[PDB]
Amino acid sequence: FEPTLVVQALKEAVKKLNPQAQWRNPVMFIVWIGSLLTTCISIAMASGAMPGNALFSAAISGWLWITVLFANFAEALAEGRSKAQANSLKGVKKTAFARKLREPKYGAAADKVPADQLRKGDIVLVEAGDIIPCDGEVIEGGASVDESAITGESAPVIRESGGDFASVTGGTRILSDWLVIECSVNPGETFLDRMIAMVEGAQRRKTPNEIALTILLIALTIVFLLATATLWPFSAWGGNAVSVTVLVALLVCLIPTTIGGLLSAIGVAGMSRMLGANVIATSGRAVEAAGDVDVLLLDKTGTITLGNRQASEFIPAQGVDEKTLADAAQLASLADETPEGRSIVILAKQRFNLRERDVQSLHATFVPFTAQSRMSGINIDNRMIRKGSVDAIRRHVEANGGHFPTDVDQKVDQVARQGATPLVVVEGSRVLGVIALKDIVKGGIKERFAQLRKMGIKTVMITGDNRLTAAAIAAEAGVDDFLAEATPEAKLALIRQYQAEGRLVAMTGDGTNDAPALAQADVAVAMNSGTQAAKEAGNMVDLDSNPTKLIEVVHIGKQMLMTRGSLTTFSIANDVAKYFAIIPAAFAATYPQLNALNIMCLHSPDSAILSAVIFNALIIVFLIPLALKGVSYKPLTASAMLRRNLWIYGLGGLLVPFIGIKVIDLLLTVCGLV
Amino acid sequence: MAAQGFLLIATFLLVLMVLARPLGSGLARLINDIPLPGTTGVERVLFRALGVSDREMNWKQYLCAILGLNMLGLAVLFFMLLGQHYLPLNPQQLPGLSWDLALNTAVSFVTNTNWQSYSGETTLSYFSQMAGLTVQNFLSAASGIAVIFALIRAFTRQSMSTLGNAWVDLLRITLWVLVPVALLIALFFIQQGALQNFLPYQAVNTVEGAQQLLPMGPVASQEAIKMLGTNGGGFFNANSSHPFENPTALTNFVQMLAIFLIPTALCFAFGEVMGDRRQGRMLLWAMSVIFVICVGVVMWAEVQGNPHLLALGTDSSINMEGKESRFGVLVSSLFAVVTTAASCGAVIAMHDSFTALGGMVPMWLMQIGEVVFGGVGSGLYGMMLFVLLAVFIAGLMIGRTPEYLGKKIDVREMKLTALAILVTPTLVLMGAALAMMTDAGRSAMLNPGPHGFSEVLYAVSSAANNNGSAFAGLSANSPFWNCLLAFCMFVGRFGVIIPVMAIAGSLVSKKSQAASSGTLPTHGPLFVGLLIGTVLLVGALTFIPALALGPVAEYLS
């Protein structure tokens, strides 16, 4: 809430924030100029000026300085919360970055060298309990690395060389065996070091939404300044002109000091909330562009559900023995590394165990399976036992003597009707049938997708399968559309087609094949398991390897925009009560009949003006937690959200200023200051 | 009383939409660059003769065309008024105008404000009234409709840079919308008893014997385009109180219909050109709600009237002073609200003789930027600016990007919308400040107390907001007043037309998307209330202190 260990120093930072740093914010510069001129007027008025009671002008000057101090307190406190989060997570690499090798494969003579000037090309071996010097990927080996000092959980996570789980970060010391690390980039200009550098070396970097709202606030400041400065020639002829300090007090009470002082605090506090959600973002422009996206690109595996397919099914086809089908399956799977595949073949093993299948990898080679290859062929003695997908099997047996009966087509049609992932693995030109792979679609995903489809969020996903099973899974899951036959150029084409309609694209990629999509995507996040080629070529990264939190990323961005709009509406709506408190009080001598407009029956004109200034000063310190946290966000449609916001921030903004001015005036009357 | 007023409002706003729907379809046809049936051959022949054929110019050339035509008309009108003595058709041998008055009325007629600080029947000649004033009323109305044509074309056009042909638009508007309806309205005026003669001034042998001179002239030709284009520059000193201009209550009703005819038809045309009539329905609903509230408030104020009438002894306390007896206080209130919200400026009752709260609402209705059926196209693009502000606020308040009919409203559009909103309150406040601290500005008084400042504020508000309606107690024939009001009218027209054309140029370059599930609809009662609240808040938060020192102080006195 209010950590005193940072309030006590950032208050001094605010005290040093007053001179010449208010020039960037125009509303803050107007209230600063008004405070300075009113203070000078009171100083000259207590000594050698004709009008008396300079104590009222001094109190006005003091409260006009206090409201500037409170707005600077908001901005500095939110910026210091961002800096405190950055300093809390900056301890990943602080001392003894002195690990290197001699031989790139397995070197010796480990000594102390400065690693802050190393270009890409160096290979670093880390032993047990030693901090990783720089980001990169594993080349040889693999170990259970920990990420406790960088992420939230303190659970070690395994790594493998040559697989998808090949990424290391210079954070928590590794509690495992040896692991070589290839240096991705020179330390200092990586993603994490760059964001700590730009938080410590703070850049404002006004987003276009912030600039447009600032232009609106400047226009309001101009009309209020004109309507206030024109009051003196108006009221000079009608009697005695109003004092300048009353005019400056009314001008400060009129201009949107609330949202004007809380705009930068809202922006950097939304950024702080992003860093608190284990998501590290380059720009607040990207943070807000994550909000109001049309399509939401995911994949069927992991984001929807990891699946863990467990289904051993048979065929009533021309194949002779399902025992021989399982024999071919276990011949293909002797050192299977994929989890769903090894679970399927161990279900086949408990279905029908095989003798003499004692990991015979001496005479057999292994072909790794990737997203681009989709092939895992194993040669046992002289054959080519197949493991690929349906398109790959069509492609490679369409060349040499293969043919397709329609029976496998009705089999995969039945598999699609049931709802599964069809594997049609064979031996050669002989067709061995289909093995269905049932995946679970469990998890609280349909409720959040239903609450997101009210928000103008298309939820097209890239399944990487055939068009029938993907359609069935999408229909039972509840997403809008789907994409089958995953290919990076197809993903680029779909993203460019959606962006050609003026629709923003939100997506998630991990590998280096997704790097063009990370580049030419409007908003995109990348998990910690991704490589540097995708981490440095994307707008946003994910500190925790969970690609299902971009929905709360969208929620936080929309919270930022709704907070800006709600406090703008509050600042605009307060001016009605500011009129009802000041205008019948300002002209208490020029037009004595104007006291009928004092609907709150306040005590005295000076007390009324002072109470209005106290409320205008204290509304910022009362709206500190709303600006630091965000609005009470609920998943409603656009019209429902608009009417709920117009109710709350737009009826409170018309009601509670009256109550605040009345309570402050009553407290001043009870205390007897006036 | 209340039932009669409600029936009057109901039949006015019924016959208005009845007469404005087919004119709305016609103006939509002129927006969509489709010629009217049976007129394309003559149009092609006239364009080939004039050399005004298809050019399809962008926003910069459109703006330069409109400003060039308006400045050329200003120069011709100014020299015509300065040299009216040598011109023919002057039966009264009226002398040439002074430089300040001539410049003031030239800028007033050019900028569609039509502020008249002179007395027409003893100041301006038959040739001046018949030619220069009428063609400048036609040109100002055509320029306003051409600018709003450019804005609607920018809203309906996708990924282009052009905005049609400004000369083609001006000729089409003037020849197929302004002139024939003006013929119908003027011939109805001669049916009801207006003037369309060129006879000299007629001496009258009175029944008692006090000889009076009757002014004549081409009244109805000016009157028809004055009501159609919402111009407001009457023939005589009385804008529409004079019986040679508005002789019948039926004529007054026809005048009110002609005042609201073109903005309502342009709202219908905008709604039909977008392809969704709900947007025009939204605009008309917001304007009608504000209009009915203002009309009811002013009617109640004038029925309450002067409280001193029963004290001094009168049949009733209704404020019939400064109102013609051919029209009730209800009808005078309705005409006041119509011509002050619509940026017309014509008066059948002197607004100075109105009560404090009854003249409060015309002041606010000018000061809000004239968005309640204002002008001919000026009010429609002012309401477009307020709609852009409202959709920006709504987009922030729902957390989406600010968009309106598919087009995303960006930072440049916000800057130009803010500037166009800022121009006229700055003008009225600066001009009132200048006129409220000078001897020449404070020496044009007729009423003391807060009402004199109300007179000054009404004059500067009508100058800045292109209304031209006057309390007429202000002696605005001074050189300082003429120059200040001429500057106010010039900037109030051409510091608002320019950023609207820049907004149109920003609008053509973008592309409109479709309506999604999360896209907030820009129609319906929620957005109608949001737009009304935006207009009321913006027009109030600038002028509550000024009205508080003026009409509010006078009412509470």
């Binding site: 125009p26 510069f29 107007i30 100029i33 001129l37 006004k206 600039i211 600032t214 232009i215 400047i218 226009a219 400041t221 101009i222 300044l225 004109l226 400065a229 003196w232 300048v244 | 930072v411 800057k415 803010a418 500037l419 601290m437």
Partner: peptide, 27 residues
């Protein structure tokens, strides 16, 4: 229009020019 009125007009004009420049160039 004494010296107080002159310096008030000058300060208000300076503030208006600063705000107009800020609106035109708002980064």
């Amino acid at each position: 229009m004494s010296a107080g009125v002159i310096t008030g007009v000058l300060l208000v004009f300076l503030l208006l020019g600063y705000l107009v420049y800020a609106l035109i160039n708002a980064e």
